[PDB]
Amino acid sequence: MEDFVRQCFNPMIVELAEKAMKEYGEDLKIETNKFAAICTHLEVCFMYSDFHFINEQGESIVVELDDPNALLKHRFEIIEGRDRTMAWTVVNSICNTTGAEKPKFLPDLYDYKENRFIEIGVTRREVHIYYLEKANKIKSENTHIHIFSFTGEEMATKADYTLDEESRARIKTRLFTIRQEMANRGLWDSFRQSERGEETIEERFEITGTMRRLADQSLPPNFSCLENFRAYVDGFEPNGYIEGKLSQMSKEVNAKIEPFLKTTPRPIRLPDGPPCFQRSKFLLMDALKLSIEDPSHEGEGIPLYDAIKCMRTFFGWKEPYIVKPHEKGINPNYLLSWKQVLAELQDIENEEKIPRTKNMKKTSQLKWALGEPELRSLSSWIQNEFNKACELTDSTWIELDEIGEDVAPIEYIASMRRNYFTAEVSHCRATEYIMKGVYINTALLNASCAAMDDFQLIPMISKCRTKEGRRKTNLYGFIIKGRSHLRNDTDVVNFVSMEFSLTDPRLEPHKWEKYCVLEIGDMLLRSAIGQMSRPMFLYVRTNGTSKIKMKWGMEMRRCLLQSLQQIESMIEAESSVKEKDMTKEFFENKSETWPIGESPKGVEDGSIGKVCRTLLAKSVFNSLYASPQLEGFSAESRKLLLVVQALRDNLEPGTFDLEGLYEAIEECLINDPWVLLNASWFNSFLTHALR
Amino acid sequence: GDNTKWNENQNPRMFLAMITYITKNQPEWFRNVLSIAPIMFSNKMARL
Amino acid sequence: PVGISSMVEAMVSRARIDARIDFESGRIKKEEFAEIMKICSTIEELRRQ
Amino acid sequence: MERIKELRNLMSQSRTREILTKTTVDHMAIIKKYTSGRQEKNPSLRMKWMMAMKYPITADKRITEMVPERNEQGQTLWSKMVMVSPLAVTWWNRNGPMTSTVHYPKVYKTYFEKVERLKHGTFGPVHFRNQVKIRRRVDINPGHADLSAKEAQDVIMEVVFPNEVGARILLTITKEKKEELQDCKISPLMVAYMLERELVRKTRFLPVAGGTSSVYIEVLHLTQGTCWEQMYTPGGEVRNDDVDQSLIIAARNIVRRAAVSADPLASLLEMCHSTQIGGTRMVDILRQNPTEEQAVDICKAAMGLRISSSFSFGGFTFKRTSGSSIKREEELLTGNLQTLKIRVHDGYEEFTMVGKRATAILRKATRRLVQLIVSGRDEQSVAEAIIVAMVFSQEDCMIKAVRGDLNFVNRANQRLNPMHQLLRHFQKDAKVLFQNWGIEHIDNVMGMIGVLPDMTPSTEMSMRGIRVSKMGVDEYSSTERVVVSIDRFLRVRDQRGNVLLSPEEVSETQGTEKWEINGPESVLVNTYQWIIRNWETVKIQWSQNPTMLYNKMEFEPFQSLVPKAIRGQYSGFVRTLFQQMRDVLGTFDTTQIIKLLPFAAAPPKQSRMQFSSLTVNVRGSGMRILVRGNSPAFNYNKTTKRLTILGKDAGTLGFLILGKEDRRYGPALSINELSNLAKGEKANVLIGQGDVVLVMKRKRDSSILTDSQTATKRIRM
Amino acid sequence: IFENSCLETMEVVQQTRVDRLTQGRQTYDWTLNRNQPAATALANTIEVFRSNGLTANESGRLIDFLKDVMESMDKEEMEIT
């Protein structure tokens, strides 16, 4: 507000209003609207009085900028531009010289031709009421009233617009432009302030009863009226009350530093009890593929018929032989549902029209399959699952799209980093896992919209390319969807997973607790010694998912980015200490080994690609086994890792309540196998850190 | 460092006091405008 | 935008001026113009109640 | 008629009629932001579900006769109810209405500018380094001719929607844009967005590590990173990094000239009003330019504008970080046995000083320096920074190191304040205080080294309390705006009692401009042009009291160009010729009056002789002017009536509101008013997007010129 | 420093319209005792205030909406449409 007022006016009117505001203790920092109103008043008076001279006879004329050649009587005497005393003095002088009764209220200008007392008022409200109020306050005296507003209207006394037409229209236009200018500047605030006759007031905010009653109840336990508290706050003395309060407070309230040496860290307490089973959404290592090696061009290859030509590639379906029950619930319903699956699969050729999506019949076994904490100790298999996730495979699983030309400075470096990472990561099994989750969740979501009422059959299909460079389509199994009336994103949709595999649950029975296993057939199996013909199994489980559960899983490719950057992070900081950055020396130096394993009671350091795929698989399992327990464990183990790292740099660190941190960590170690694997990893890390 | 459950320990009446001291010698209407929220949090209801 | 008039008071005047200009220099049937302005005066009588 | 029909069928429902009646136009923006606000359902997923559907794109109805229904392979791309398949786009993209609309690169110039900067943007090597963030204040817009947002969106409204232009009815880019893209409009709203993105400046605080220009910042993702750096020169440069420099030079020269003036304030203001910078006026630029420089801040303060808390000293602008102060005047003895009264800064204080080429952070006690972190570019630059720092330190140690008489003078032969006297002494020879300051042991930590008196960096030894930062000290330009209290001698105080700035520290670079400071040709042409400009008042001021017209100090720059020896003879000769013209009425030609007038400013001497030619020394060499007819110095064409001064030319000899909408003078008009300009006509027109106002012609200007100064003739009588 | 901050706060409270109340996440509508988007709950509150004798926010300044809020707590009956 203030800067704009100082912008659209000459510094003389600004100085006049600034001096005129020091008159009644009216601080200009607060009464800025009064500042604008007074500046407007003064410029209105000036542009009203300018260029009006009195001819040698008794009439007024107009002139250019200025030329006081023998004629100086301005036809108008300015009053408001002067001080109070000088204004009254000039008013008395002209009243005694002319014989006109001086007004009791201070006027702002005086005319000579009509010998009238012209007083002008600039208002924002309706001009009619302002004129009526100015008349009711000043009446019965020969004093002419002239009222302007920003809207363009104008009101004089008895239609006596005692000026020229254009010389007054100039004031109308200037006021109108000021109105518009403060409008598009958001400064039409003064509508509620000058709307009082007294054009100075600012918005006063009242606090009346039934509200002050809450203000009076919000004070500390010493007062009754909040005004007492405000006056108490107005006068405050920084006398040193803190020292008295400290001497008054007990000495036991203290931040006692407990030292942190390599003897203090004790290994993490681990839960004991039943072994932790698998809660992952789909099978990772035990599921096996049903290849078709088809260059179908992925032209939105209809995902159902791809699965039936998967089935066309395997023969030797034994009679469904239930092997492992659920240990609770109707186990044969799963195999009955499987028989229904095979029937409705082979019942398509009886239909005059192929449907692209088979809506399963509302069978009672399928109705039951869709439904229409304890301390679990760590198990031995999650490490093996992660190991097989870190292993290299035969396929590629990536379509990494092109990128522009390689201009010189950093794009060369960016290239020789990312392409090295891709070549060391493309053939990883975790890439297959990511693509698998992507395909399954994408098909599930795209079906969850159009199949809002009926059960749809969604094949767990992936695609890849073996080293011979030929496109291959893989089948992991089928999934039966419940009803998908997804009103919200937390709406639950149940599903049943039936996945092919070659791993017998009879080896590790506790792992498949949420699973019913059906010996489903026999397949040709090649080994180190010819064929073996190992049995093909079907793992069936019942679970639920929601829209957020799928979308976190349709965005799983971040696990590459999150890997690369968390690799690239290491390639920046440790390489920041270099005139010419160490970027190629990171790779191509096989002597530099990275500690990643401990089999023989000793640190087993590996090569670099093992590290790249290890971090990728870490991100993959963090995404698929995503659990708030892992979140809390990571958040609470970062602190102990940082303390250990600061000790490794020998910076004499310390804590306050390390037992409290141990308590907080043990509070989030219950049943998730991924969290427990990370915990045992961390214990082994503390063991091998000279601690 | 970190302050455990610190956000639940900040008392709205203390905020009323610190605002009142920040609004020292300012016009009363402005103090009244800014003092609304801490009073509403001194007497506030929690939806279950 | 900047303006103290009501929305309707500005819209009616803009419609009338546009009708005038695309009738005189532009090309429009006089009857369409007349119906435009009869609806405008209908609003003029309607915004008063 | 569709719009007004919607209005009618909308105004019948009461709860909408009331809101269309009450709420005004000014507030449409406050009612535009009232939405349901729910259509945020995974825009990628909903987009994919719609793209998977048949014909998700909706177009107009003119494709029926523009594209075929079935393509070259019988693919459906239409509908009826008007949905459209995306492949239709690719068809129209292949062979359709080819047009010469390749006229495009004039509205989208702001992007092809970056393209061309990339073309010849020669690259360099990647010297990797631990890049440290420099908190700088930079602008993020290339090549916009330095136009503020308000006047730029006004130009937008003018060039894209003339029929609803704003109400300010009192500018060359407007002509250029309205001319070049007149009939080749693309999408008015997008055109407005593109021009508001091209022409509007914006300067704010960003962390940079070497980028100054706008071209060096728009490509910051290539230059700067976490721990890398790339020397990249985009083979170009813009206007907005060498335009504010012209204003800086103007302010420096104006202050340097006003310091000699008898009334520095009035002379400086009269110069600032009568100065043009690249087709513009200085007052509006200063009102809208956010450039920070001592002279610029003085010019702003001259018009009562808020600027920073700048505790400017020695060209270094200071900003307070923490700490209070108390005046507490005190006496001190020098190193040459000299009493000096001084304002001893008591208490604990914390400051950040930003300089031209160096910056520093200081923590200082009463007459004792606690801590100081400095960084500059040149060895002598950090030397000067440390000199001004030690001067402000006010320690007794630097007091003892004063050698010689302390008499340093202003250009007006004035006593400089004691602090500035110490600084100006130390700036030439400061090797006395260094070896007398004190040395200490440091630890050489975190890229913080010490300096030695012999201009040598050191690892474990430094001066007492000093730290030299590697790769730059972090700058902080805190935003604070408070009113100023300017005096008549160009020394500004912050109204509480702090002298903020003074001209004693202004000049370091006499930039070659990329009122007698220009060549004497400009003195001649400017004198004659000023005579021709206010000629109508001179005509009667030459007749009435011409002794005041001659002694007008506006002739002093030219009165000093005529040789100082034969000045009075010329003055007496021209004055007696003027008196002869005054006596014999009617027998006088104005040409000779303009030809010989500005010489009458001299104190005449009654030379019993006459003249036919008068001489002026320009660049040494003398140029003549005759007394009859034309000359190369005064060449006035008979027919053209134009005056030629050394080839150079020298002179020659909206509307208003009448009230609200008034149904008298016809129906309402649009804002295109050239046919009612017959001799003058009143007409009611809808201005802006509001109501209708009457409009008449004009007879006066109402500018920011001397009309504002006429108040001094009725005030302060 | 508190006084300069207060000056900026006064400039804000003078210029602030009701649009700066829409820029935000989901809000709580007390009219329906339910969480609703910002502009929806705002329009509900505006219409239920206009149903009663509280029409100060028509000026557009947020301070007038706050004045309406203040006057609203003083009334005995609250009829919702």
XYZ file of N, CA and C in Angstrom, chain A residues 2-3 6-7 10-12 16 29 46 50-51 63-67 73-74 77-78 81-82 151-153 166 169-170 172-174 176-177 179-181 183-185 407 409-410 417 445-446 449 487 489 547 551 554 572 576 578-581, chain D residues 26 41-42 45 49 123-124 126-130 150 153-154 166-168 170 222 226-228 230 287-288 304-306 481 483 537 540 655-660 687 693 697-702 704 706-712 714-716:
348
model
N 1.785 1.332 0.954
C 2.581 2.542 1.141
C 3.442 2.841 -0.082
N 4.130 1.822 -0.606
C 4.998 2.031 -1.762
C 4.204 2.503 -2.974
N 3.414 6.129 -2.528
C 4.614 6.885 -2.856
C 4.975 6.813 -4.335
N 4.349 5.917 -5.098
C 4.644 5.753 -6.517
C 3.843 6.698 -7.412
N 3.539 12.894 -6.623
C 4.746 13.695 -6.516
C 5.207 13.771 -5.061
N 6.522 13.842 -4.829
C 7.025 13.848 -3.445
C 6.592 15.058 -2.630
N 6.043 16.103 -3.257
C 5.596 17.267 -2.496
C 4.295 16.976 -1.756
N 3.753 16.651 2.222
C 2.677 17.383 2.882
C 1.815 16.454 3.726
N 2.144 4.259 9.635
C 2.376 2.843 9.370
C 1.095 2.035 9.517
N -5.329 20.401 -5.569
C -4.360 21.019 -6.470
C -4.861 21.025 -7.910
N -5.615 24.419 -10.155
C -4.603 24.762 -11.145
C -5.220 25.425 -12.371
N -4.435 26.311 -12.990
C -4.734 26.879 -14.307
C -6.012 27.709 -14.297
N -4.976 28.953 -18.289
C -3.637 29.304 -18.749
C -2.777 28.048 -18.794
N -1.570 28.194 -19.343
C -0.635 27.085 -19.485
C -0.004 26.807 -18.127
N 1.115 26.074 -18.103
C 1.745 25.673 -16.847
C 1.811 26.824 -15.845
N 2.552 27.881 -16.175
C 2.619 29.050 -15.307
C 3.257 30.208 -16.062
N 2.773 31.418 -15.799
C 3.412 32.637 -16.283
C 2.866 33.820 -15.494
N -3.300 36.259 -9.133
C -4.435 35.813 -8.328
C -5.021 34.526 -8.897
N -4.765 33.419 -8.211
C -5.114 32.071 -8.636
C -6.599 31.735 -8.589
N -7.880 29.941 -3.174
C -6.945 29.974 -2.057
C -6.962 28.606 -1.393
N -5.795 27.968 -1.348
C -5.649 26.640 -0.768
C -5.549 26.769 0.742
N -3.622 22.507 2.465
C -2.202 22.267 2.259
C -1.307 22.900 3.306
N -1.834 23.840 4.082
C -1.074 24.558 5.092
C -1.322 23.955 6.475
N -16.111 6.327 -8.630
C -16.948 5.732 -9.666
C -17.215 6.666 -10.841
N -16.915 7.959 -10.715
C -17.148 8.926 -11.766
C -18.249 9.925 -11.476
N -19.152 9.619 -10.548
C -20.209 10.557 -10.202
C -19.634 11.775 -9.482
N -14.279 20.282 -18.408
C -13.126 19.416 -18.643
C -12.128 19.470 -17.491
N -13.508 17.113 -15.198
C -13.462 15.764 -15.745
C -12.064 15.172 -15.630
N -11.035 16.022 -15.624
C -9.679 15.539 -15.376
C -9.558 14.911 -13.993
N -12.100 13.678 -12.285
C -12.895 12.452 -12.362
C -12.071 11.303 -12.932
N -11.351 11.567 -14.024
C -10.556 10.533 -14.677
C -9.393 10.084 -13.805
N -8.712 11.025 -13.144
C -7.598 10.641 -12.283
C -8.076 9.771 -11.125
N -10.756 7.903 -11.145
C -11.213 6.641 -11.715
C -10.037 5.713 -12.015
N -8.947 6.272 -12.545
C -7.757 5.474 -12.816
C -7.094 5.015 -11.525
N -8.722 4.378 -8.769
C -9.602 3.284 -8.368
C -9.213 1.988 -9.063
N -9.144 2.017 -10.395
C -8.828 0.803 -11.143
C -7.440 0.275 -10.786
N -6.472 1.180 -10.613
C -5.102 0.782 -10.314
C -5.020 0.076 -8.969
N -7.450 -1.387 -7.676
C -8.255 -2.595 -7.805
C -7.407 -3.758 -8.305
N -6.734 -3.581 -9.445
C -5.917 -4.677 -9.963
C -4.663 -4.928 -9.133
N -4.319 -4.027 -8.215
C -3.275 -4.264 -7.227
C -3.803 -4.948 -5.973
N 26.344 -35.168 -26.093
C 27.178 -33.969 -26.075
C 28.233 -34.163 -24.991
N 30.291 -32.576 -22.119
C 30.787 -32.472 -20.733
C 30.448 -33.584 -19.745
N 29.166 -33.824 -19.496
C 28.758 -34.799 -18.493
C 27.950 -35.937 -19.085
N 28.289 -44.257 -17.069
C 27.777 -44.779 -15.807
C 26.528 -45.640 -15.997
N -5.375 -54.558 -12.237
C -6.026 -53.252 -12.182
C -6.928 -53.037 -13.391
N -6.400 -53.271 -14.597
C -7.191 -53.040 -15.799
C -8.415 -53.944 -15.857
N -11.662 -52.708 -13.336
C -12.597 -51.661 -13.729
C -13.788 -52.217 -14.504
N -14.975 -48.431 -4.722
C -15.454 -47.077 -4.468
C -14.306 -46.177 -4.031
N -9.981 -46.124 -2.520
C -8.710 -46.773 -2.809
C -8.346 -47.821 -1.768
N -6.542 -50.931 -4.282
C -6.048 -50.099 -5.375
C -4.652 -49.563 -5.081
N -1.171 -50.228 -7.097
C -0.402 -49.134 -7.683
C 1.008 -49.078 -7.109
N 2.720 -51.470 -9.421
C 2.736 -51.039 -10.811
C 3.776 -49.959 -11.055
N 29.348 -40.275 -6.367
C 29.575 -38.837 -6.282
C 30.410 -38.458 -5.063
N 33.926 -37.118 -5.104
C 34.061 -35.669 -5.031
C 35.477 -35.253 -4.666
N 38.517 -35.357 -5.802
C 39.275 -35.582 -7.025
C 39.266 -34.303 -7.848
N 40.427 -33.947 -8.400
C 40.474 -32.873 -9.388
C 39.702 -33.277 -10.638
N 40.102 -34.387 -11.252
C 39.345 -35.028 -12.316
C 38.649 -36.240 -11.706
N 37.317 -36.244 -11.738
C 36.546 -37.187 -10.933
C 36.883 -38.634 -11.265
N -15.076 -6.875 -9.938
C -13.777 -6.890 -9.265
C -13.488 -8.218 -8.580
N -8.304 -38.420 -9.475
C -8.272 -39.871 -9.306
C -7.204 -40.458 -10.223
N -5.949 -40.419 -9.746
C -4.815 -41.020 -10.446
C -4.818 -40.596 -11.908
N -3.602 -43.092 -14.367
C -4.386 -44.315 -14.511
C -5.703 -44.060 -15.234
N -6.810 -45.636 -18.800
C -8.081 -46.323 -19.011
C -8.883 -45.689 -20.135
N 31.256 -25.699 -25.364
C 31.378 -26.379 -24.087
C 32.836 -26.362 -23.631
N 33.093 -26.992 -22.487
C 34.426 -27.063 -21.937
C 34.661 -28.316 -21.116
N 35.282 -30.766 -17.739
C 34.612 -30.961 -16.453
C 35.687 -31.079 -15.379
N 36.045 -29.950 -14.776
C 36.910 -29.966 -13.598
C 36.016 -30.197 -12.384
N 35.867 -31.467 -12.012
C 35.071 -31.840 -10.850
C 35.633 -31.191 -9.591
N 34.739 -30.860 -8.662
C 35.137 -30.200 -7.426
C 33.971 -30.245 -6.452
N 34.287 -30.062 -5.170
C 33.249 -30.010 -4.150
C 32.525 -28.678 -4.258
N 3.362 -5.463 -14.056
C 2.105 -4.732 -14.216
C 2.022 -4.069 -15.587
N 1.694 -6.863 -18.312
C 0.362 -7.404 -18.545
C -0.591 -6.344 -19.086
N -0.335 -5.061 -18.807
C -1.074 -4.009 -19.496
C -0.772 -4.021 -20.990
N -7.394 -1.860 -20.310
C -7.513 -1.223 -19.012
C -7.863 0.251 -19.120
N -8.202 0.829 -17.969
C -8.724 2.187 -17.918
C -7.646 3.261 -17.830
N -6.369 2.901 -17.709
C -5.332 3.930 -17.724
C -5.162 4.415 -19.159
N -3.649 7.465 -20.209
C -2.731 8.597 -20.296
C -1.643 8.336 -21.334
N 22.692 -28.514 -16.325
C 23.916 -28.946 -16.989
C 25.158 -28.424 -16.275
N 25.662 -31.825 -7.516
C 26.040 -32.022 -6.121
C 27.523 -31.745 -5.909
N 28.381 -32.367 -6.721
C 29.823 -32.230 -6.561
C 30.538 -32.082 -7.899
N 29.890 -31.477 -8.892
C 30.514 -31.300 -10.195
C 30.271 -29.891 -10.714
N 30.706 -27.638 -14.771
C 31.023 -27.650 -16.193
C 31.122 -26.223 -16.706
N 11.508 3.572 -9.781
C 10.344 3.095 -9.041
C 10.125 1.598 -9.225
N 10.559 1.034 -10.357
C 10.296 -0.369 -10.650
C 11.536 -1.245 -10.802
N 11.756 9.171 -1.428
C 11.109 8.551 -0.281
C 10.745 7.089 -0.437
N 11.632 6.284 -1.013
C 11.373 4.866 -1.225
C 12.096 4.009 -0.194
N 11.445 2.919 0.213
C 12.064 1.970 1.127
C 13.175 1.196 0.430
N 12.687 -3.417 4.198
C 12.286 -2.168 3.560
C 11.698 -1.214 4.589
N 11.336 3.285 5.626
C 11.347 4.641 5.084
C 12.677 5.328 5.391
N 8.270 31.084 -23.801
C 8.465 31.885 -22.597
C 9.716 32.748 -22.696
N 9.148 36.332 -24.399
C 8.671 37.458 -23.605
C 9.665 37.722 -22.482
N -8.425 10.165 -23.265
C -9.604 11.006 -23.104
C -9.904 11.159 -21.615
N -11.063 11.746 -21.309
C -11.471 12.010 -19.936
C -12.900 11.542 -19.700
N -13.195 11.212 -18.444
C -14.516 10.737 -18.047
C -15.392 11.936 -17.710
N -16.598 11.966 -18.275
C -17.569 13.009 -17.977
C -18.639 12.553 -16.994
N -18.654 11.279 -16.637
C -19.651 10.739 -15.739
C -19.992 9.315 -16.129
N -21.086 8.825 -15.558
C -21.498 7.439 -15.737
C -22.091 7.253 -17.132
N -15.460 0.904 -20.664
C -14.020 0.863 -20.441
C -13.680 -0.357 -19.599
N -18.670 4.686 -19.207
C -18.378 6.049 -18.786
C -18.391 6.947 -20.014
N -12.868 14.912 -25.489
C -11.503 15.093 -25.965
C -10.604 15.550 -24.815
N -9.399 16.006 -25.152
C -8.433 16.495 -24.181
C -7.950 17.885 -24.573
N -7.479 18.626 -23.568
C -6.842 19.919 -23.788
C -5.576 20.125 -22.968
N -5.249 19.235 -22.034
C -4.062 19.373 -21.205
C -3.453 17.990 -21.016
N -2.261 17.955 -20.418
C -1.461 16.737 -20.341
C -1.470 16.094 -18.958
N -1.214 16.882 -17.912
C -1.156 16.413 -16.525
C -0.076 15.341 -16.356
N 4.149 14.459 -14.919
C 4.874 14.502 -13.653
C 5.853 15.673 -13.698
N 6.942 19.985 -14.269
C 6.994 21.127 -13.359
C 5.641 21.492 -12.750
N 4.530 21.055 -13.355
C 3.214 21.265 -12.753
C 3.162 20.791 -11.305
N 3.908 19.734 -10.970
C 3.975 19.286 -9.584
C 4.769 20.253 -8.717
N 5.667 21.027 -9.321
C 6.518 21.978 -8.620
C 5.861 23.342 -8.454
N 4.728 23.578 -9.118
C 4.009 24.837 -8.961
C 3.464 25.009 -7.550
N 3.331 23.915 -6.793
C 2.866 24.012 -5.413
C 3.735 24.962 -4.601
N 5.051 24.932 -4.830
C 5.979 25.803 -4.117
C 5.702 27.281 -4.352
N 2.382 28.500 -4.278
C 1.296 28.838 -3.368
C 1.460 28.256 -1.971
N 2.300 27.245 -1.796
C 2.723 26.821 -0.467
C 4.037 27.526 -0.164
N 4.318 27.728 1.125
C 5.537 28.415 1.560
C 5.648 29.810 0.945
